[PDB]
Amino acid sequence: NKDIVTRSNLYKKYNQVYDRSAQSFEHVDHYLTAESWYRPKYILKDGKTWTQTEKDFRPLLMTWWPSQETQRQYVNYMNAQLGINKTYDDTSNQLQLNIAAATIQAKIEAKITTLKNTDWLRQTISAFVKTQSAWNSDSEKPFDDHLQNGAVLYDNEGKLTPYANSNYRILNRTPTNQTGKKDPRYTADNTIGGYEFLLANDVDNSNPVVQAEQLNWLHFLMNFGNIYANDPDANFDSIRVDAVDNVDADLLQIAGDYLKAAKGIHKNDKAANDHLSILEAWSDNDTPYLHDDGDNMINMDNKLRLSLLFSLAKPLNQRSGMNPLITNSLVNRTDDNAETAAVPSYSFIRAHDSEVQDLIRDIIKAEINPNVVGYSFTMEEIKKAFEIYNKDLLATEKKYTHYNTALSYALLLTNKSSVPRVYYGDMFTDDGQYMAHKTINYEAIETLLKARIKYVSGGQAMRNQQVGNSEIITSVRYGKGALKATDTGDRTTRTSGVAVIEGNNPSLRLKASDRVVVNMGAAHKNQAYRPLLLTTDNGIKAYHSDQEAAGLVRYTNDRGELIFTAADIKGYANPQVSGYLGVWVPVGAAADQDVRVAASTAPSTDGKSVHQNAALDSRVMFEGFSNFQAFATKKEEYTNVVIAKNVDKFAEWGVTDFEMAPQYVSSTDGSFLDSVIQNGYAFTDRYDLGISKPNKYGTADDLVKAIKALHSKGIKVMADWVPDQMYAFPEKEVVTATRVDKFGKPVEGSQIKSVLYVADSKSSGKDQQAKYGGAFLEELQAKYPELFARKQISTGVPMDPSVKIKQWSAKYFNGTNILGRGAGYVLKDQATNTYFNI
Ligand SMILES: [Ca+2]
Ligand SMILES: [Cl-]
C-alpha cells in the first residue's frame, strides 16, 4: 500500500519522501509509474551540500528500483550518460550498486546546478525506462494486424480501478452483428462485418451515456452556425458516418431517427435531398441493412467501385473484362428504365482514403522501406514517395497510379441510378496547396460535369460488344423525359442524352467489316451529333461548344443509331487513356439547357426517406479535400478561404453536395497517417472546429464563411461525423487492462491480463468538450422524446442523457492501441507484490 519507498539507498533519511502526502508524488489515480518523480526531504544541492525542497522534484529511480537487477541496469545506463567509465556485471553486490547510485545522484545534482534546469534528466530517465522489457513494447508483443500493432481492452470490473468500470463495452456490434449474433437476413458477407478496435482510443458506442453524447455532437454539427456564430446560414446540412463497421450500429438508428425527427427527411424528397447523408460502410451486408432500416442514409456502391478499378484503372495484364461495368453494381445498367431505382447509392473510383494512401504504401514498401506498419508513415517517407507518384501520374506506362481516370469519370458522370462523388485529387494534385495545380484529367472531368448538367437525363442502356481482337462497351442516356428506347420525347429530349464508347485494351483493332451500332433512342432519328471527348495519340481532346466540334459532325440513321467503324474506334496508350474513350452529344442544345429536376414535396409512401429518382440522379457529390494537401504558408492558401473564393466553380460543375474534410483540430502525436498530415480524423476535442487554433483548412471563422459561400449558391455542406476513436488525451489514467486482437479476444500468454496499465485517456475538462458536452440533451429530449424512448438494438435500453460528458475518461472507452509502456509500468513493492497506492 503506502509504506516508505527505500537498504536500497544509504542516504535513506535525506532522499526519503518529504511527507506521507499525495502532493509530494507525481502519481496517476494514486498509483506510481517508472517515470514518476517525487519531492525528497533533502536535496544534495550541487552534489555538495545537503539542502532542506520547494519545487525540487527528483526521479524516483534516482533512489528506488523495483528489482536489484533494475538498479544494476540503471547504474550501468546513467554511468554511460554522465561519463563514469565503469560498468557492474551479474555478480555485483548490493553495497557496490548503492554506492554507484549515491555517486550518479551526486553528479545528477551537479549537472542540475551547472545546466540550471531539469529537462535533460526527464529525457535521460525516460530513455533508461524504455530500455527495460517490462516498461516497453517487449511485454506488449506479439504484435497483431491492428493498424497500430495491437490494442488493450479495459476490464468492466477492475477492483483496483473502479472509476474505469463499465456495465457495457459491448464489442463488434456492426450492422451485421448488432444483436451479438450474425444477422440471418444478410448473406453477401459470411463474416461479422467489421471489428471494434481500428485506431487510437476506441470510444464505447455501446454505452448509453456516450450514445446520447454522439447525438449531442450530431445536433451541434447540424446547428454549428446557430451555436458558434449565431448565424443560421452557417449550419452543416448533412453528415458522413465514418467507420460504420468499427462502431456499435445503434448510432445508425440514432442518426436516422435524428434526421427524421429534426429534418423530416421521411416526409418527402425535398427534405431528404436537402440533408443527403452517407455512410462509409465496407461490408456487402451494410447496403441491404441500410435499405431495410429505411434508406435514412445512402452507402457507397462498392461493387461498381471494384468493377471500375479492375476493368479500367489496374495495369494492362491485371485488367478484367469490361462486362462488370454493366452488371457488377447495385444496379444492372443493361436496361435501366426505372423511375426510381430499388436502392439509392453514391459511386466513386477514388476518395481521400481509397486508392491514394494504398498507392503511397505500395511505393514506400517497394522503393524505400519494406517494414512499413500499415499506414503509419513518417513525413519524410511521404515526401519522397510523392516524387515517384507525381512522375508516374504523367507516364504512359504507370507502375503505381490509376490508368483510364477519364474513362472511369465518363461512366460515373453519365450512369443512371447513383449520385456520382468526384474526388478532389482527380481534378487537382493530391499534394500541394488547395486548387493550386490541375491534373492532366481536369479538363476531361470539368467538360463531363458541365455536359452532365446539360445532356445527362432519361433511361440508360449499356452494351458489351466483342469486336476485332478485344471488346467495347457503349453507355447511352436517351434524354430528358425518355425512360425507354421507344419514347419519342419532346424538344428537350431531342437535344439531350449522351453516348459513351469505351475500350480497356490499347491493342483494340476493329476489322474493316466491324460496325459498332449505338441505339441513341426513338427521340434521335436522323440527327446531327458532335464529339464532347475524343481519344488522341497524346491524350483526350475536349469540345466546349457545338462550333469547336463543327468539323466532326456525324448523323444517326432513320432508326436513331450512331454507327462507328475502324476509322473512329481503336486502342491508344497515352498518360490519360489505355484503351479508347469517345463521348458524343446531340447538336443544338441551348447554352443554358439544364435537364436536372428538383425534389418534389409530394408525400413519400414506400416507407423509405431517400429515393434514387431523376431528382437524386440530378445531384453531384464533391469530396473537397486530399489527405496529402500541403500545409498552408499564408492565409490566402487556407482551404476554407480558397473554397469561399472559388464557390462559382462548384456551382458551374453542378456540385449539389460539398463533402468537407473533418474540421476538428488535429492531434500531432504522429501515431498514424491522419495525425501526420492532420486531415481532421485524429483529434482530442470533438467540438474544436478551428476554435482554440486553426485546423489544416483555416480558422472557425474561415469555416463559417466557407459554409455561407456554398449556401449562397444552393450547395449543401456535409459534416464528417467521426464517433469511432479519439487521439492524444492530455491527462493519464490507470486502468485494469487485457491485451486483445482488433476483435477484443484476449491474446496467448500476455503478461497484460487483468493488470494495471497507464493510458492517455482523460480530456483537459477546460476544452470545447467541457463547454458543449451534453449541452443540448435537454433541448433534444424536449423536442424529440421518441429518440430517448427507443430501446437501442445492441443494449436493449434507451440512450441515457441523465449524465453529461464534460470530461472524457477511460470508463467511456472500450480500450486503446498499445502505447509501448509495458506490462509493469505501474510500480509494485518487491516484498508484498502489491501495487503502490498513496
Ligand atoms: Ca470501435
Ligand atoms: Cl427497369
Q: 286-293 and 250-258 are packed helices; what angle lies between their axes, rounded to 10 degrees?
A: 40
Phi/psi-derived region of residue 123, left when phi > 0, alpha when psi is between -120 and 50, beta in every other case: alpha
- Amino acid symbol at 343: V
Given a contact cutoff of 8 angstroms between Cβ atoms, the answer to whether 634 and 163 are in contact is no
User: Between the CA of residue 327 and those of 171, 323, 366, 407, 462, what are the distances in Å?
Assistant: 36, 7, 35, 17, 9
Given a contact cutoff of 8 angstroms between Cβ atoms, the answer to whether 16 and 50 are in contact is no
Distance 329 CA to ligand 2 centre (A): 14
Distance 238 CA to ligand 2 centre (A): 30
For residue 506, give the C-alpha cell.
Answer: 490499347
Which ligand sits nearest to residue 335's alpha carbon? Answer: 2
**Residues in contact with 380: Cβ distance below 8 Å, sequence separation at least 6, in sequence order:** none
Which ligand sits nearest to residue 332's alpha carbon? Answer: 2
Distance 352 CA to ligand 1 centre (A): 21
User: Between the CA of residue 655 and those of 232, 234, 618, 627, what are the distances in Å?
Assistant: 22, 18, 10, 21
Indicate the resolution in Å: 2.5
Q: How far does Cα 158 stand from its chain's mean position?
A: 33
Q: How far is residue 747's CA from residue 738's CA, in Å, rounded to a whole number?
A: 8
For residue 263, give the C-alpha cell.
Answer: 429534418
Q: How far is residue 122's CA from residue 35's CA, in Å, rounded to a whole number?
A: 8
Which ligand sits nearest to residue 485's alpha carbon? Answer: 2
**Residues in contact with 81: Cβ distance below 8 Å, sequence separation at least 6, in sequence order:** 124, 128
Q: Which residue has 447509392 as its cell numbers?
A: 345
Distance 406 CA to ligand 2 centre (A): 27
Distance 333 CA to ligand 2 centre (A): 9
Q: Which residue has 453516348 as its cell numbers?
A: 499
Query: First vs last Cα of the chain: how many Å apart?
Result: 7
For residue 356, give the C-alpha cell.
Answer: 491514394
Q: How far is residue 307's CA from residue 327's CA, in Å, rounded to a whole number?
A: 9
The domain limits of the chain are 12-136, 457-586
Q: How far is residue 145's CA from residue 724's CA, in Å, rounded to a whole number?
A: 18
The DSSP call for residue 632 is P
Which ligand sits nearest to residue 333's alpha carbon? Answer: 2
Distance 827 CA to ligand 2 centre (A): 69
Output the CA angle 186-192-198, nearest 5 degrees.
Answer: 130
Question: 318 in helix, strand or coil?
Answer: coil
The continuous run of DSSP H or E covering 112 comes out as: helix 94-114
Given a contact cutoff of 8 angstroms between Cβ atoms, the answer to whether 207 and 808 are in contact is no
The DSSP call for residue 19 is -
**Residues in contact with 774: Cβ distance below 8 Å, sequence separation at least 6, in sequence order:** 212, 213, 216, 801, 803, 804, 805, 806
Q: How far is residue 361's CA from residue 381's CA, in Å, rounded to a whole number?
A: 9
Radius of gyration of the chain (CA): 32
Distance 312 CA to ligand 1 centre (A): 34
Which ligand sits nearest to residue 249's alpha carbon? Answer: 1
Distance 204 CA to ligand 1 centre (A): 7
Q: How far is residue 461's CA from residue 656's CA, in Å, rounded to a whole number?
A: 25
For residue 445, give the C-alpha cell.
Answer: 472531368
Q: Which residue has 465514418 as its cell numbers?
A: 242
Q: Please, which residues bridge with residue 461 across strands?
A: 335, 476
Q: How far is residue 635's CA from residue 612's CA, in Å, rounded to a whole number?
A: 40
Give Dmax over CA atoms of the chain in angstroms: 109
Q: Which residues surround ligand 1, an ion (CB under 5 A)?
A: 196, 202, 246, 724
Beta strands in 342-392 (DSSP E): 345-347
Given a contact cutoff of 8 angstroms between Cβ atoms, the answer to whether 838 and 2 are in contact is yes
Given a contact cutoff of 8 angstroms between Cβ atoms, the answer to whether 464 and 423 are in contact is no
Q: How far is residue 113's CA from residue 115's CA, in Å, rounded to a whole number?
A: 6
Given a contact cutoff of 8 angstroms between Cβ atoms, the answer to whether 405 and 416 are in contact is no
Residue 147 phi/psi, 5-degree rounding, is -55, -25
Distance 420 CA to ligand 2 centre (A): 20
Strands 151-154 and 731-740: antiparallel
CA-wise closest residue to 291 among 280, 299, 300: 299
Distance 332 CA to ligand 2 centre (A): 9
CA-wise closest residue to 629 among 440, 436, 421: 436
Q: How far is residue 444's CA from residue 88's CA, in Å, rounded to a whole number?
A: 72
Return the sign of the alpha-carbon dihedral for residues 46, 47, 52, 58.
positive
Q: For the domain bounded by 457-586, which CATH number is listed?
A: 2.60.40.1180
3-state class percentages of the chain: helix first, strand second, coil last, to nearest 5: 30, 20, 50
Q: How far is residue 527's CA from residue 584's CA, in Å, rounded to a whole number?
A: 12
CA-wise closest residue to 112 among 142, 82, 143, 85: 82
For residue 323, give the C-alpha cell.
Answer: 462486362
For residue 419, give the C-alpha cell.
Answer: 449520385
Given a contact cutoff of 8 angstroms between Cβ atoms, the answer to whether 16 and 822 are in contact is no
Q: How far is residue 790's CA from residue 777's CA, in Å, rounded to a whole number?
A: 15
Q: How far is residue 571's CA from residue 592's CA, in Å, rounded to a whole number?
A: 35
Return the sign of the alpha-carbon dihedral for residues 391, 395, 399, 403.
positive
